Amino acid sequence: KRSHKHPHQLSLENGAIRIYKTGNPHSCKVKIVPLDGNKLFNIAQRILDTNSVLLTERGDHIVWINNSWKF
Amino acid sequence: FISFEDAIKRVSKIFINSIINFNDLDENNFTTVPLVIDYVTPCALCKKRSHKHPHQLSLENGAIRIYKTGNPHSCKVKIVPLDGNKLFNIAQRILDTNSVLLTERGDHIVWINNSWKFNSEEPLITKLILSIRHQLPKEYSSELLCPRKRKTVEANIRDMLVDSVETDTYPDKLPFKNGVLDLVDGMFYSGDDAKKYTCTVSTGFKFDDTKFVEDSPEMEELMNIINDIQPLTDENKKNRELYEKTLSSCLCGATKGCLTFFFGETATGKSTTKRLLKSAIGDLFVETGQTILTDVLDKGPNPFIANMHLKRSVFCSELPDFACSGSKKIRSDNIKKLTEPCVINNRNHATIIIDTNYKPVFDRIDNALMRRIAVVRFRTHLDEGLDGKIQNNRYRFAFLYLLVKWYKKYHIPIMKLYPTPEE
Amino acid sequence: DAAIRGNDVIFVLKTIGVPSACRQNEDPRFVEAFKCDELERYIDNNPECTLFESLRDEEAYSIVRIFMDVDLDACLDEIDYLTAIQDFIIEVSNCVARFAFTECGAIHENVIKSMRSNFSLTKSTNRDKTSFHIIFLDTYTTMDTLIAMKRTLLELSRSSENPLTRSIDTAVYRRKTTLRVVGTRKNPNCDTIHVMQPPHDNIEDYLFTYVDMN
């Protein structure tokens, strides 16, 4: 569409974040996003975001410990 | 269905607050009597505060629906459906997308990151299940965060996959690592548009349309070079066609049962065309020596017999002269037993092509060999800049345009090569 | 195959529960055939009529569009209605595409593309009830494929939990099926009818017996 002259709006329902267009809701798409999920999944996400574990073409897993890559 | 007691437990679990008329609920009047909820905390359906109307339950399609008397928009409708497993539903939905398939080889192929990949020592199915969780409904998304549940879904997917399919069926499509190029007109499918083509191989590099254009000096000087190689001379009038055809047949995906030999003298760009073709193809193009053609390939180990698996074209050169006494001439039995459509699931479509500077000699000759002998020769006799052009490989797409045009002229009408028994 | 043969005449029953003998003899008071313009003119002239769409001969031409109906006895707000219908379309399209790839031998991607390309919505004037019929314009299929798809759709309706999905009335995949014409009264003394949507203003898109391959 073009610029969505009607402003968007936010809501929370059952722990899910919902985005919808005000005015005519049929002129856009309503989106839903989960909030947190599992705690261990969040820990895995945080660990992966540090780029400390990598996968090579050969199939190896390399980690960054004590200022050195090892496998 | 399930026992009524499990249903009562489920509806009681649905509502956070307690039920004061639970004892009044029976198996024969559970859809008529209203239920009164002790509203000490907001209900899970809608927060609000202290609903003043009792709710009610209805049984349709093997599901229990909760609806609040009065205005319907006050409280959200809740449904307890499908007394049964949820992970089976998730496995069904995942299989419905045709993202995982089974092949006769015994392994599975998975569609990840716009690529078909198969590998039997890693859990690709679990990776697919984790990745595809966004396309599923919200309530199914949080169910796949536990690895044990992912293993259960993977087991369900494995059990419900009985039929087997065969990959690499269309010989008229050349795969890339990020899509598939087509031979009918020369336009590049990208993304899910290439999903229908079950391709398990790739050229190893991107395809970009910017260099695949016609108005540029690069391929103009490319035809300049090839005219320096194959000029439009009467002596080449018979050669050109077949030569062009052979190059275009380098791109074909069907099995090749016809040999192709190039005869010429030293310093005659015959080795240069190897580089022009290999830069144009990539990893699919493969080299070979004289070790395998003159030796029995069915005796002892042969890594090349395993290696040609889904190779696109194979090139043989630097052949020593076989006319010398004591030099072991070629074995035509080999040249018979690679021309078959399969050399133990050895799917083979690599075009055999040979550059030699000597007249071949055969131990024994019949109609069969001469029926599948084709010969082509080159006519001219130094520009080192094009060598750098090839090493840094800016001349790919300009050359594949010539292959595609030649394929249009010759191979689109029919997939067939015409040999020349004359020599 | 069919090629030139394209259905354009609208066959209509003017009363539910027509006698069989009257149907075989083409009773003018129970059985009729209009065109698109004729049908809209007939509807416009008589707003109290009861017209019901069905086929005439199933042994010669049985090419129709893919139709299902939904009915929840619960009013819902707008945004949840949009989410429910989008989940409905994605589920049903994926399911029928899988069925076509498996049993019909078709190709999944073009089926999902054609079915997600265009679709029409209806609505009911009732304030406590939400019922609607969806018809897919660029999908064509025979009767036997539909009765085979009946079992698949019924397990899908049992399996899912979305409120719009659980109301798939599976019985409409039967021999000699009939569907109420949109904008027409159901009962002689009932004011509840169906209304159009802004996306589609043409009645030809609301009839499944009209076949026009583009």
Give B30-69 as a DSSP string: TTTS-B-B--SS--SS--SS---S-EEEEEETTEEEEEES
- Give the integer Cα–Cα distance in Å for A15 and A37: 10
Residue labelled with tokens 């028994």: B421
Six-digit token string for A43 = 């820990």
User: Which chain C residue has the Cα nearest residue B69?
Assistant: C74
Beta bridge partners of B80: B64
Pair C7, C61: CB distance under 8 Å: yes
Q: Say if the Cβ atoms of C82 and A25 lie within 8 Å.
A: yes
Terminal Cα distance for chain C, rounded: 15
Q: At C136, is the secondary structure helix, strand, or coil?
A: strand
Give the whole-angstrom CA distance, residue C188 versus residue B152: 55
Question: Measured between alpha carbons, how far is B14 from B57 in angstroms, rounded to an integer?
Answer: 13
CA distance B272 to B267: 10
Distance CA B307, CA B346 (A): 9
Residues B128, B129, B130: CA angle, nearest 5 degrees:
90
Helix C78-99 and helix C143-159, axial crossing angle in degrees, nearest 10 = 130
Residue B299, token pair as written in the block: 């005796």
CB B58 within 8 A of CB B78: no
Q: Are B286 and B315 spatial neighbours (Cβ–Cβ below 8 Å)?
A: yes
B-chain CB neighbours of C158 within 8 Å are: 61-62, 81-82
Asked whether the CA dihedral B291, B294, B296, B297 is positive or negative, the reply is: positive
Question: What's chain A look like in SS3?
Answer: CCCCCCCEEEEEECCEEEEEECCCHHHCCCEEEECCCCHHHHHHHHHHHCCCEEECCCCCEEEECCCCEEC
Task: Judge residue C116's burial from the number of C-beta atoms within 10 Å of its C-beta, 0-12 exposed, 13-18 middle, 19 or more buried.
Answer: middle
Cα(C63)–Cα(C141) distance, integer angstroms: 6
- What is residue C137's three-state secondary structure? strand
**Rounded Cα–Cα distance for residues B186 and B198 (Å):** 19
The structure tokens 């005659």 sit at B268
Residue among C77, C80, C83, C90 with most chain A CBs within 10 A, to mutate: C83
Angle (deg, nearest 10), helices B385-392 and B270-281: 30
Joined together, the tokens standing for residue C139 give 């999908």
- Give CA separation, B53 vs B22, B40, B79, in Å: 17, 15, 19
Find out whether B239 and B376 touch, Cβ atoms under 8 Å: yes
Cβ-based contacts of C121 with chain A (< 8 Å): none
CA distances from B342 to B301, B309, B339, B374 (A): 18, 10, 8, 22
**Do C109 and B137 make contact, defined as CB atoms within 8 angstroms?**
no
d(CA A70, CA A68): 6
Q: How far is CA C31 from CA B229, B261, C128, C189, C211, in A?
A: 79, 77, 34, 21, 21
Please count the residue pairs, one from chain A and one from chain B, whose beta carbons lie less than 8 angstroms apart: 14
Residue B269, both tokens: 């760009």
Three-state DSSP state, B220: helix
CB contact under 8 A, B145 and A37: yes
The four Cα atoms C93, C96, C98, C100 give a dihedral, to 10 degrees, of -130
User: Exposed e or buried b for every residue in A23-53, given b needs 16+ CB within 10 A?
Assistant: eebeebebebebeeeeeebeeeeeeeeeeee
Partner residue opposite C158 with nearest CB, options B77, B82, B96: B82
Contacts (Cβ under 8 Å, ≥6 apart) of B192: B114, C109
Q: How many residues does chain C have?
A: 214
Q: Which two tokens stand for residue B389?
A: 């052009």
* Contact at CB, C83 and A32, closer than 8 angstroms: yes
Name the residue facing C74 among B72, B139, B196 (closest C-beta).
Answer: B72
Q: Could you say which DSSP state residue B239 is in?
A: H
Instruction: Residue window 14-53, chain A: list those with CB within 8 Å of chain B.
Output: 14, 16, 32, 34, 37-38, 41
For residue B59, give every residue at least 6 positions away whose Cβ sits within 8 Å of its Cβ, in sequence order, or none: B31, B65
B-C contacts (CB, under 8 Å) = 57
Q: Which amino acid is at B237?
A: K
CA C16/CA C52 separation, integer angstroms: 8
Tokens representing C38 are 């004729």
| Interface touch A26/C83, C-beta < 8 Å | no
CA atoms of B341 and B255, how far apart (whole Å): 6
> Is the Cβ pair C74, B97 closer than 8 Å?
no
- Residues in C closer than 8 angstroms to A25, CB to CB, are 78-79, 82
DSSP assignment letter at C9:
P
Among residues B107, B111, B108, B89, the alpha carbon closest in space to that of B99 is found at B111
Residues β-bridged to residue B380: none
**Contact B77/C74, CB-based, under 8 Å?**
yes
Give CA–CA dist C167/C205, Å, rounded.
23
Neighbours of chain C (3+ CB pairs under 8 A): A, B
Classify the C-alpha dihedral B400-B404-B405-B407 as positive or negative.
positive
Q: Is C132 exposed, middle or buried (0-12, 13-18, 19+ CB in 10 A)?
A: buried
Q: Provide the 3-class DSSP secondary structure of residue B410.
A: helix
Task: Give the residue ranges of DSSP H helices in chain C.
Answer: 20-24, 36-45, 78-99, 108-117, 143-159
* CB pair distance less than 8 Å for A38 and B145: yes
Active-site residues of C: which are they? 169
Q: Is the dihedral of CA C194, C197, C202, C206 positive or negative?
A: negative
B72 → chain C, closest CA residue = C75
Write out the two tokens for C172: 């409409």
For chain C, list residues whose CB is within 8 angstroms of any CB belonging to chain B: 73-77, 80, 87, 90-91, 94-95, 97-98, 101, 107-109, 128, 157-163, 166-167
Unique residue bearing structure tokens 């002269």: B321
Is A25's CB within 8 Å of C83's CB?
no
Strand partners, C130: C72
What are the chain A neighbours of B142 within 8 Å (beta carbons)? Answer: 34, 37-38
Q: How far apart are CA C125 and CA C120, in angstroms?
A: 17
Rounded to the nearest angstrom, the minimum Cα separation between C196 and chain B is 24
Q: Which of B413, B410, B404, B406 is nearest to B187 (CA)?
A: B404
Give the resolution in Å.
2.9
Among all chains, which residue has been given the structure tokens 């800049």? B385
B96 CB-near residues (< 8 Å, 6+ apart) = C94, C95, C97, C98
What own/partner pairs with CB < 8 Å and gap ≥ 24 does B192-197 have?
Answer: B192/B114, B192/C109, B193/C109, B194/B114, B195/B111, B195/C109, B196/C107, B196/C108, B196/C109, B197/B170, B197/B173
